[PDB]
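As the next step, I selected for study a record pairing a protein sequence with its backbone structure tokens, which the following lines show:
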Amino acid sequence: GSSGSSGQVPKKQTTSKILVRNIPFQANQREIRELFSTFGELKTVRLPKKMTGTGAHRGFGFVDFITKQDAKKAFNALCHSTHLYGRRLVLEWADSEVTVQSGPSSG
């Protein structure tokens, strides 16, 4: 039960960030990159890389789209049901933190 529907007035542009979790140890950057790219142009595909220490590639990936639409169609296109290497991936919209700025936007 995770209901986080709150925050100041809604902004014209909605947070377009597809965070794929529960990723198999077999999945790699390129794997996800295309996996989503096929649906549309991806801003940037970020994935965890094995680093000196325990655990190589965690089960979480960040996927950014060019436009909200492509992100919506893709997010759902997969979210519905995505099986990779015998694993049901979990697509969720990365939760952002509410930060109120002080100075205006000159320009």
